[PDB]
UniProtKB/Swiss-Prot annotation, chains B, D:
It comes from the Bacteria. Residues 37-49 bind DNA. GO terms for molecular function: DNA binding; identical protein binding. Induction: Negatively autoregulated. Transcriptionally regulated by the MprB/MprA and PhoP/PhoR two-component systems. Expression is growth phase-dependent, peaking in the stationary phase. Probably induced upon phagocytosis. Virulence regulator that has both architectural and regulatory roles. Impacts cell wall functions and pathogenesis through regulation of multiple genes, including the espACD operon, which is a key ESX-1 component. Influences target gene expression positively or negatively, depending on its binding position relative to the genes it controls. Acts by binding directly to the DNA. May play a central role in regulating virulence gene expression. The lineage of its organism: Bacteria, Bacillati, Actinomycetota, Actinomycetes, Mycobacteriales. Keywords: Activator, Cytoplasm, DNA-binding, Repressor, Transcription, Transcription regulation, Virulence. Its main location: cytoplasm. This is Nucleoid-associated protein EspR. Gene3D superfamilies: 6.10.250.2310, lambda repressor-like DNA-binding domains. It comes from Mycobacterium tuberculosis (strain ATCC 25618 / H37Rv). Homodimer. Binds DNA as a dimer of dimers. It is found in: Cytoplasm, Nucleoid. The gene is espR. GO terms for cellular component: cytosol; extracellular region; nucleoid; peptidoglycan-based cell wall; plasma membrane.
Length: 131, 129, 131, 129
DNA sequence: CGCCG
C-alpha cells in the first residue's frame, strides 16, 4: 500500500544510532562496500527519490541488513505494519517535549498518572488533533 | 571510572535495532568476520566476563564501529557520561506507565505541551514531591 | 541459502489442488493474465530454470500470490524455513504407501501406535536411512 | 443426496493453502472482484447459510474456478464422492495421532513398508477389530 | 527481459 521508496526513506529518516545524526546516503554505499557489496550511488539516489522502482530481490536485502531489519519490511505488507508502530516510537522517543514531560511524570503514582494522561487528551481534543 | 567490561555490556543491553531484542555475542563476531575483521568468541566473551582487560586500540575500534558509536565511549570519561545520558533515556522511557502517555503527548504544539507540564506539577505538589 | 529458482520449483512441484496434477508453467502466465498482470513466458521459464536470477520485487509478489502463499517465502529466510516443513508434509500425504498405512493404523489405541512407530524406526535404522 | 450449501462449506473447510487456515468468505468475493467477476457477500453468505439454493450456472463456476476444482463437483453426485475421497483424506491425517507415525514412513523402500503393514496387523489382531 | 545505470 505504501510505495517502496517511501518505505525506504522512512528508514534513513528514523533508524540511526545514538549520539549522532541519521545515516547519509553515502554512508550506506560505503558501508555496503566494506561488507563486500557493490552498489551504485546514483542507483541509490534513484531508488530513494522515486525515479526508479521494482528493485532487485537482493537489492532490498542489502539495504535491509544495513539498518539491520528483515527484508520482509519491504516485501511483506504484514510485518511492515507490525514494525511500523516501532519507528513511530523511536521518532517519539527523540522529540524533546515528550522527553521533558516523561522525565517529570516519572516518579508518579498510577492513579495520578491517569489524571495527567487525561489532561493530555483534552488538549488533543481541543487542538483539532484528536477531535 | 567504570570497568570497560561493564561499559561494553551497557551497549549490548541498550543499543539494538528496532523490531527485536538485544544483540547476541555471536551476531557480533560473525558481523566482524563479514566486514573482514576477525576476533574470537572466547576473547569477546572473555572481555565481557572480565577475565581480560585493557583491550587493543584495534578491537575497541572493531566494536565501537559495529555498534556505530564513537570509540571515545570506552576511553574518554566525558563523552562517556554525555553519551550515557543518551542511553539512560532510551531505557527509562520503554517503561510502561510512561509509554502510554508519552505516546499521546507527541504532536501537541509546544504551546499546549507547556500546559501539560504545569498540570503535572499540580500533582507533583499534591503528593509532596 | 536455498537459491530462488529452486524455492520456486519447490512451489510448482508440491503445491497444487486436489483431484488433479500440478500447475504447469503456462497455467500460471494465463491465470496471471486474467488477474490483469503481464509477464513474459520465457522470463518465467528462465527464472524457473535458473537462466536468470534476482527478479523484481513485484515479480516475486505475483507468483507467490498465484499459489496463495506469502511473498516473504522468497525473501525472508526464516519464514521460508518455517513454511518448508509444510510442503514436505503435503508431499507426504500424497505418497500412497503412507496412506495405506495410516488408514490402517487409524483406529488403534495410544500405546499400540507407539509400538508401531518404533518398528518403523528400526526399519529406518536398518535401511541406512536413519543413522 | 446431499445439499449444495453443505457441499460448499465442505470446500471452505477442507481446501486451503499451506501455512494458514481456511479461506474467509470475503477473501473469496474480493479475489473474484480481482479476476473481474462480481458477487455480494450477502449472496455468498446467503448461499452457505441455505437461504438461497439452485445457484446460477455461472456462480457455481465462479466458485469452483477459485478453489481450482472442477465445477462438476457441485452437480455430478458421483464425482462429488470420488473427489470427496481426496478430501476426507487430507483430513483424517492432520489429526496428530497419526501425524507422527506418517512422517516416518516416507522413503522406506516399498519393500520395507510392507513389513510395517504387517506389524500393524499383529497389533490390530490383538485388539479386534 | 528485465533489472541495473
Amino acid at each position: 500500500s505504501t510505495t517502496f521508496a517511501a518505505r525506504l526513506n522512512r528508514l534513513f529518516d528514523t533508524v540511526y544510532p545514538p549520539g549522532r545524526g541519521p545515516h547519509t546516503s553515502a554512508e550506506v554505499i560505503a558501508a555496503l562496500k566494506a561488507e563486500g557489496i557493490t552498489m551504485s550511488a546514483p542507483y541509490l539516489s534513484q531508488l530513494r527519490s522515486g525515479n526508479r522502482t521494482n528493485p532487485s530481490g537482493a537489492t532490498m536485502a542489502a539495504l535491509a541488513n544495513f539498518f539491520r531489519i528483515k527484508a520482509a519490511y519491504f516485501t511483506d505488507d504484514e510485518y511492515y505494519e507490525k514494525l511500523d508502530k516501532e519507528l513511530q516510537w523511536l521518532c517519539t522517543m527523540r522529540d524533546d517535549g515528550v522527553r521533558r514531560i516523561a522525565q517529570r511524570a516519572h516518579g508518579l503514582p498510577s492513579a495520578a498518572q491517569q489524571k495527567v494522561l487525561d489532561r493530555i487528551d483534552e488538549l488533543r481534543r481541543a487542538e483539532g488533533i484528536d477531535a
